[PDB]
Each structure stands twice: as structure tokens, then as C-alpha cells.
Amino acid sequence: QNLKSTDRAVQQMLDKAKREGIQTVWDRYEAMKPQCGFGETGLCCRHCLQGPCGILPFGDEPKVGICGATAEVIVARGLDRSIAAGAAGHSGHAKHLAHTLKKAVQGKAASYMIKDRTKLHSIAKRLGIPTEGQKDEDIALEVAKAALADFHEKDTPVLWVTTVLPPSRVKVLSAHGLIPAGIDHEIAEIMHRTSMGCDADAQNLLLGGLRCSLADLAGCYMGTDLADILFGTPAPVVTESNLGVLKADAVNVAVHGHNPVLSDIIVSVSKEMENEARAAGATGINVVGICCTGNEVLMRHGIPACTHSVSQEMAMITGALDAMILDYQCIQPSVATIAECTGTTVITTMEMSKITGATHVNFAEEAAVENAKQILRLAIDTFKRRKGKPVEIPNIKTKVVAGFSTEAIINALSKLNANDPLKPLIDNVVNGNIRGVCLFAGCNNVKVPQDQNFTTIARKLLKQNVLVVATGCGAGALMRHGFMDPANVDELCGDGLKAVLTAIGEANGLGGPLPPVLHMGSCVDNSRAVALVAALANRLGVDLDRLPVVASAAEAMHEKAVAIGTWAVTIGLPTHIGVLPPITGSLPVTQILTSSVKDITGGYFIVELDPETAADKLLAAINERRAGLGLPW
Amino acid sequence: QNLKSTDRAVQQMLDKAKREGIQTVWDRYEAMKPQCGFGETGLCCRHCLQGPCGILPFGDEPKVGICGATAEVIVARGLDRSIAAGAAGHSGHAKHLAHTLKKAVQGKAASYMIKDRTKLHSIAKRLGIPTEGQKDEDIALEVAKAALADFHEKDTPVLWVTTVLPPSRVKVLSAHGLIPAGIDHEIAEIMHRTSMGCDADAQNLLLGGLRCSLADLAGCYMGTDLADILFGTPAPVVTESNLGVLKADAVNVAVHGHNPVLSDIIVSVSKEMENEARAAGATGINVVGICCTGNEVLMRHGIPACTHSVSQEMAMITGALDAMILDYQCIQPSVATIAECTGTTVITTMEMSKITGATHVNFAEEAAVENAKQILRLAIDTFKRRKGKPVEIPNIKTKVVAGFSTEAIINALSKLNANDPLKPLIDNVVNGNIRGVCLFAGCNNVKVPQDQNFTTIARKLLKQNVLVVATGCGAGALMRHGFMDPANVDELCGDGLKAVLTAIGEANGLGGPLPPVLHMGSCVDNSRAVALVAALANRLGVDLDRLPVVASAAEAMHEKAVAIGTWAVTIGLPTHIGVLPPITGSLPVTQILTSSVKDITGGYFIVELDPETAADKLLAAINERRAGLGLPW
Ligand code: SF4
Ligand code: SF4
Ligand code: FES
Ligand code: FES
Ligand SMILES: [Fe+3]
Ligand SMILES: [Fe+3]
């Protein structure tokens, strides 16, 4: 079981699933093997009905696609489409929040409101929206309008790109034609240019892809901005993670997917429904999180993280999960089948996201609270059906300190320097106490023993005094192995990093250090890491490609993670990916993405499947940036 | 050679290519075989880095994707993405024309103008744009603005859907949530919903796909509307088709791709450059068309069609093609390699469409004429380099009558009935002289002997008195085999259809019938067929799904043709496809697309690879509609 997941609760549930004859993601992976080498390497094209066209990586024919598409054209086109798909996911999330804010301030969705006035004003100033003497509702209406305008061509480029990066970075990108014109515009242009008989130049295609990845970044930053306005900017919180946060005595309700728009209401309403839960014979309603929707409610409300990503089915194998409430993205459709065995009620709530066999509740913001009550009532009924059933919740959980928004990180730092909060951090970068910054992002992947890359790399970097921050299922991997518990600072952190975490925490009235890893939120909250890095760049007077900052999508799966890794490269970061992306079938494309893009954006991909080697390579990237600033290392 | 293409000029050039060691599309197809059965059937998914996931059509494992995606989810998601890609091609074409018109009437692109005042006013009235007392330039500015607005969400749905179909059809579509909200919005939503862990219900996915196909229809209709405003509505023209329209003594210049924005200027400017061509020792400049850009200039100016689609390389094998001038879509990138052997200068002109090894001229409307001159000068230089070279142009061409816009068809009919032009057509439908209407659309496909399906089906339908109209490479196939020469009416048409073609032509001062097939233009001009069918529906008082009208993508290749076939189904037509689309790996998806969609939109796919059988099935669909109207058959 240890080759499947390094998570001991996951291993326990894998034993139970095996016992009970429930097929898992790892079983389905095993039945897939051996997987197709054309597709693994990127050398397959299905973009027209003359295909499929495969190209042998090595050897004889086929060597070229039927229309004459070369290996590097086919590889570049497939990669571009995955970037567009990731952009469309982060785009749709952000767009739905933009409409939600619009409805709220126009009197049409009373369940929603401006919860963060300060964030709303900051964003409007960053956008050029006049706030002086304006009502909050009108400012927010203008912010929502600008959000929706960034999806199409207009007078200006995508403002959630050009106003969030430092002017020098915008200038580098703009000299290369990389600034997106509109988010959905770029997505559509990708799909056009990659379709048969269109763009057939690897460099041209990849440049289009860098621009589309910045449209993805715009969607991420928009989604973060709007969720913060709507639901509050995260501040440090204490909670728990892993399957042990389920309670046999409670109605256990998982919020799963990505968009917090429904699940924030779920969290607020379940408090009122606790009495009706008690009448059903439960102790109450226990909301737990899965994947990024769980990260959102953990970040803002301290909702305990139940599990993530590849292991999501295991939450249901316990037999104690009464409801799993879905919006969209990264939901294994297998859940709808597994429910018939485990008694879980699986509830879809989004029109564009249905799963055959799952109960659908047609959620609308205009009636959010009522939908919430309905959904929770289904959960309560499900609990009633397992009164007296045996469950098996692994008694395994970790302590998680989280809520490290960029505003929270700055506020924490400001207790060491009120007028210049970034300076203590920069000071300790310069004197070597902090060697660099590494952002862990992205998913788990069934091909990698769950969490093994995240924790192996994290461990080596923390011993080398790297400040580690994390999002998404990277943050989930680290939280489930204790990397967010301050009690583990002694064991995990080098002396200089330990000193800095301890100074900041003890100056923030925690009596102890910050946790070993800083949890910066959901996958769209990778934008927060951008906000931090851009701030450091502005404070130092240098472009982002001169900072000792790296990223690692150590166990990447989703097309969103490919989009994210590509924009990390495009804004100038050495960007590791710990799973094989479909580019090895073309050496020229590989050379562009790992070497020559350095001369365009200053960032580059680091493809490395061995996590020890990957940690070495990330240390080398950090230290080369250090040397480029004339710092010791 | 006859198993490759039924075109005798193509066969001659295939002999020459074989002689000279130039690899062709058919050779590359042969080296691809045997092709992958997972991909052919649709049972492959690469939408995340846990894949590729294949599902065996029959037998043992793998039976399910790694995330639990079933065969019908995988099939529906792949089909939806191809519909979005086709939508993005027709979308990008239309968008570029919309910007071109905007620039023209704002004083920024003097090479462009309002060439069709009547079309501009008609379109504005159809859209609700006020024209009374407005300057033409301001009306056109409003029309361009509305065009660009249809790409994103706004107060209204996509007007190039809701104002071009009869109200009853809009009502049927709208009851099913099928009306697009914005063109690029729908494309992005497809890419979101089909990405990993999102929509996993075959019916939900396919409904999303029908809506996206209507976004494709909107792009098509927009592109037709705007090109007609900018360059003139086609009226009947006489010209020629096939390779024999090349002349050894001239500078031979192919316009190839889809968007007429550059190539219309090429046509106008080459007239002025004829003297400079003569000074180079040529007789002049001979512009010829390939694919849909060629269809555009054939439709408006009578430019001879040189070849189409699968056989495009053969135009260069002659050795007499001095320049091939590309915008985007359906260009085999092989041309850029083949040029090094044939001496042709291959010129790309679009930023999102480059081919390694091809000369790029950065075309801008603001300087169109100057770009045109530059491009033509390159052609002239190329001619100079083959002074005295032997060429081999097959002396094979057909006579083509074309230019049958819907306005032209109505004007022709109006000579039989001035006040009620649709009535003579309807009369002859009712008395059986016209059994029905069949639209031939779409590409050639290397898997089908070139043109064999188009001509076999056309022949059987014409003998049965079907009015046949055609677009795109379907029109190209029929024109190259004489189906657009009125001299062949006697041989090809049944007596009743012959009678109708003869009455209309003799009443239009042609001294003979209309040609056997009516050429309605490029692939976006499939919208013209919609305009005709909607008009017939409005004139009869019935929805489109009650009319004896069918469509045939007899040799479909491109994702655009899949989008087109899907919207033909969505607006209510029996819609044949003569190539295997990637849906056979899922029986439920096949059942939806060929049977149960009848109960939603009234149309349905007819999948049939045998063209004799397909003709029978199209006759049966037509006659079942006839019976449903209570007509004899
Ligand atoms: S676009 Fe080219 S490479 Fe792709 S499937 Fe079609 S013929 Fe093959
Ligand atoms: S989305 Fe599902 S079926 Fe597709 S590649 Fe990923 S795991 Fe396999
Ligand atoms: S040949 Fe296997 S991915 Fe296409
Ligand atoms: S397995 Fe061949 S198309 Fe993917
Ligand atoms: Fe996740
Ligand atoms: Fe074509």
C-alpha cells in the first residue's frame, strides 16, 4: 500500500477498499498499464478526422503527421490546448465569482455581500477605479464590470495581468507580444491556431501558449481578488487535516471542487442547522474540505481538511461521509459509483458539472441559503440511514496552521518592521538565514506515490533554509504530513530558517514559530504567491527573474497545473515539474521550454522525476539567482 | 492512383510526385497505417497527466479512465473539444473581419470600405440597429460593435444566433438551454467542462456541445455577413476549376486558407501589377484559388479554382506555382517543405498562423495594399527564377458557374415570381419536381478516395430530383467533376429537377438551365444555406425540422466540419457524415447523436461510410420529411 500513497490514513482505507471489492483510482491506473508511449511523449494528434496520427519517438515510420505536422508542431499544439483548458477552468471560476459579486451589489443575491471593504478599495485603486466619495456597492459594481471586461478584447489589455505585475515585467512581456488581449479571446485563439492547417511553427505556437498562460494567471488573480472581497481575506487559522477529522457521531459533509461560492454558504448555514442535525440524532454538522474548495473554507474559516486529490475516494471508504457536495474541477467521477457502495449522497450543484448517478441540486446565488438548507437536509437524511452502522475512520490527523494570505504574511512581517514589512524578510534573504523561496503548487498524480515528491523536496529545501510556501494539493500534501504544525519546526527547518520563523511567530503573539510551510490557499491563490513575489521585486528594484524564488509542481496532474507552471515560467521563475509532461517526444520543444525561454522571460521549466535530484536542481536555481544578486550562498 | 483521388489532374500530379521522390499526403497516410483504434473510436483521453487513458471498445481492461471517466464521458468530451475548436476557427475568422470593418469606417484602413450598402442596411435592421437618418459609416460601426459583442456575455444572447433563425426554432432551442451566451464564452466553457474532474454526464456534455455548435454557426453567419458588406454579395459568375487554370506563361499566385481579408486585396492589386509582371517576362498575374479563400474570390470575382483540400500539394507539383499566399486553416504545413523542391514561394501573412521554412509577411489592413504589392513582387521574382523551366500543368479544367448567394438565388427565383420569389421553389417541392434539398459541405479526407463520396451521392440525389447546393470543399469536389457546368444538366438531373433548373435559368437570361449544383460559397457560407432554409421555413409556417432539407459532410476532416455538422443537427436537419467520427466507441453517445437528439432538436446524424447507402439514407430522410408535410414521394 506504501507504493500507492505515503498517507497512513489513505493506506488504511486502501486496505478497506481492497477488502470490500471497491475499485480505486490506483486499481484503475494498474489496469491502464502499459500506457501509450505516443501520448505520454506528446507524439499523438487527433485534431482532425484524418488521424489519429502518432509519431514514433525513435526509429522508422510514422515520422510525420498526415497533413505534414512535424513532431514539434504536434507537441506544441497539444501543450497549448492543455494551457487553454487550464485557463478556461480558472477563467470560469473567476467569471462565476464576478457575476456573483455583480448580483450581490445589485440587490439580486442577498446571501452574498462585500465582506472585505479594504480589499475592495485596494483592488479598485490598483485598477484605476475611482473610490473617493463612491458607495461601496458602486465601487464593487465597477470592479465586477472590469473583471467581466477582461474576458474579451477592449481598449486595454487584460488588467488582471498588467496591473498585478511590476512595470518592468510587463515591459519584457509586452516586447514579446505576450500580454493577453482578453481571457476567453486567448483561449479561443489557442483552439483556432492549434486546429488543423493553422499555426505550424513550434516557436510561434509556444509564444501563443505563454500568452494564454498569462490569461490563466489573470483568471487565478481575479478569482482570488473576488473571493476575498466576497468572503474575507484569509488570516492565520488553526485547524486539522486528514481523515481523522471525520466524526462517526456527526453528519459528515464534504465540500469538494474549487469554487467557494456555494460552500462558503454551506459553512455558514450548517451552523444554523446544527439543531436540526441534533434532532436527527447526530452531534451536529461537521463540514470538512476536499481539494481546493476545502482549501478555501480552511483558509477563511478553519474548516478541517479531510483529504485531497488522488485519494478523495478514501474519504467515502470510511462509510461515515454522509454527503459530498460538488461544484467543479478535479472531482473523480468514480465518486458517483462508489457512493452506491458506501451510502454517501453525492450532490452536484453546477450546470456545467454533472455526474451520472449523482443527485443534482440546481444551485443559484439568488437562492443560495435555500439550496444550502436543501443540500444539508439530504446529508442529515443520509446520516439517519447509517444510525448504528459500523464506520472505520482512521484515527489519523495532523495539526494545521494556515490562512497565510499575502496580506497576512505582510501583517505578520510588519510586527518586526512596521513601516517596511518586506524588509525583515529581505534582510534574512541577504544574510543567508533564508536561502530562497519555493512555492509548492498543483495536484497529486497516480503515477507518483501520493505526497512522496512534495515531502521529499520540501524536506531537503527546508534543511537548506528555503522559505517554503504552498497551495492547492501541494499544500494538502504538506499539511497531511505535519509540515504546517509549528511543533515540527525543530525537526524540519535549518537553523537560519528556524530563527526567522521563530522571530516572526514570537513577534505575532503565538509563543512559537510560524509553521514550517506557509499555506497560501487554493490553486487560484497561486496568485497570492505572485502578489508576494511582485511585492518583493518592487521593493528590491529588480525584475522577478532576478529573485531567488522557484516553483515546484512536484506531482502535477491537471491541465490547470500545466497552465500554472507555464505562467510561473512566463513571469520569470525556475519552475520544476515532477511528472512527465507530454513534451519529451520533441527535443526542440523541450529545449525551448527548459533552456531558450530563459532568454525570453527569464524563467524556465525544470523537468525532473527524481525528487532528490529535483531538490538539488531547485537549490541550484535558487543559488544561481543568489549569485546573480551578488549574495553569498 | 485512382484509389487516392478521382481527380485526373490529381492523378497526373501524383505520378509526377512519385517520379520525383516528393512525399505526398497519401504517402504520409500510408506510413501512418494501421491507425490507432482507441483514437479512431474516440476511446482515448489525454486531458490530464495521469493519462493517456484508452478504453478497449470490446474485451477486458482497460474499461474505464483512471479518474473513473467512462467510455461515454471520454467520447463526449473529445467531441465537445472538436466542436469548440471548429467554433474557434469560424470565430476567429469572423472576429478578424469585424475588426477590419471597424478599422475601415473609423478611417484607419483605407484599402477597405462598405462595398454592399444594401447588405449593411439589411443586417442592421435584422439586428435592431437604427438606420433612418444614419450615415453608412455609423451604421457599419454599430454593426461591427454588435459583432464583437456577440463574443462575450452581455444583456442579450448571441444575436448572430437568435436573429438568424425563425422564432419557433429559437424557442425550441431556448427551452433546452441551447442558445449561446457569447461565442468565446461557449468555447471556454467547453474547455472547462471537458477538463479533468468536471462534467461527467454524456447527455449534459452533448447538450453543451450543441450550444457550442450554435456559437460556431454564429461565427459562420457573422463571417458571411461581414465579408459581404466589405467585399460584395456574390452574384452568379462564370469561371473554371482544376489545375489546368494555371498558365505556364503567367506569374501563378495561389490564394489559400479561409479569410478573404488579404486575398481580396491581392485580387484587386494584381490587376495594377500586371504591367510590372509583363516587364518580368510574364503574360501577367494569374490569381487562382485553393480551399475556402479561393472559394471567396471565386464567388465574388470569378477567380478560377485551382484545387482544394487533400490535393493542395499537387498545385505545387506542376512546378508552375510561383507563390502560395496563406492566411489560416486547412493549410497542410507540408507545403513549406515541398516548396524547397518545387521552387514555390510560400508566404504566411497571419500572426497566429506560421509554418517553419515559409516566408512571413506581417500583413496589416492599415497597409494592405502595400503588403499586397510586396507579396506579389516576391511572386514575380519567383517567376523569373523559372524562366525556361519545364512545367507540367495537366490540361484539365472544368467550367464553373457559381456565385449563388442566397440573395442571388432569391433574385433568380424572383424572375419567375416578382412578389413571392420563394413560391416557385416551394411549388416544385410540392408537386415533386424538386424532391428535397441537399447541402454538401466540408472537406476531403485522405481516408476517402478524393471526391468519391461527394460525386457518388450527388449523382444519386440529382437523378432523384433533389436540389443540390454545396459549399467549401464539397463545392470544390463537385465543381472539379463538372457538376457546376450547365451543359451537364441533361446527363445528371432528373426530369423534374431539369425542368426547374431550365425554367429558372431561361428566365434569368442564360439561354440555358442553372448548373446541376448551386455553389453557395465558402465554409462560413454554410450560413447562406441556413439563411435560405430559414426563409423557406418562414415562408411555409413550419420549423426547420419539418422541411425536406438534409446536409452531407460526405468526406469530413476538420474540426470545423464537425462543428458544422453538429449545428446542422441542432437547427433540425438530417445530417450525414461520410467519414467515421470518433463516437463509435460509445453506444450511448452514438444513440444520442443519431436517434434521441431527434426528440430535442428534430435533427440527427446519419453515419454512413458507403456513399450508395448514404444516398439511400438521405433520400429516406428527405422523403420522410415529405410525408410529414403530407406530400407525395
Ligand atoms: S491535424 Fe494533421 S497530424 Fe493532426 S490528426 Fe489531422 S492530419 Fe493528423
Ligand atoms: S481526465 Fe481521466 S480519463 Fe482523461 S487522462 Fe486524466 S485520468 Fe485519464
Ligand atoms: S496513439 Fe495513444 S495517445 Fe494517440
Ligand atoms: S491511445 Fe491512440 S489515440 Fe490515444
Ligand atoms: Fe485537488
Ligand atoms: Fe479546404
Author numbering:
A (entry chain A), B (entry chain A): 4 to 636
Q: What did the article's authors report about this structure?
A:
Notably, the R57G/N59L mutant displayed a 10-fold enhanced mediator affinity (Km ≈ 0.2 mM at 30 °C) compared to WT without compromising the catalytic rate (kcat ≈ 2,100 at 30 °C). The dissociation constant (Kd) values were 449 µM for WT and 144 µM for R57G/N59L, showing that WT has approximately four times lower affinity than R57G/N59L. The overall structure of the R57G/N59L variant, including B, C, and D clusters, was highly similar to that of WT (RMSD of 0.240 Å for 604 Cα). However, the local environment around Gly57 was notably altered due to the mutation, leading to the formation of a cavity (cavity volume: 38.45 Å3 for R57G/N59L, no cavity for WT). This structural change, particularly the enlarged cavity, appears to indirectly influence viologen interaction by altering the spatial arrangement around the interaction site. Analysis of the catalytic properties of R57 and N59 variants revealed significantly different reaction kinetics for viologen reduction compared to WT. Specifically, these mutations seem to mitigate the repulsive effect between the positively charged electron mediator oxidized EV and Arg57, thereby facilitating easier access for viologen molecules. The formation of complex structures appeared to be influenced by high concentrations of polyethylene glycol (PEG, 25% (v/v)) in the crystallization solution, potentially interfering viologen access to D clusters.
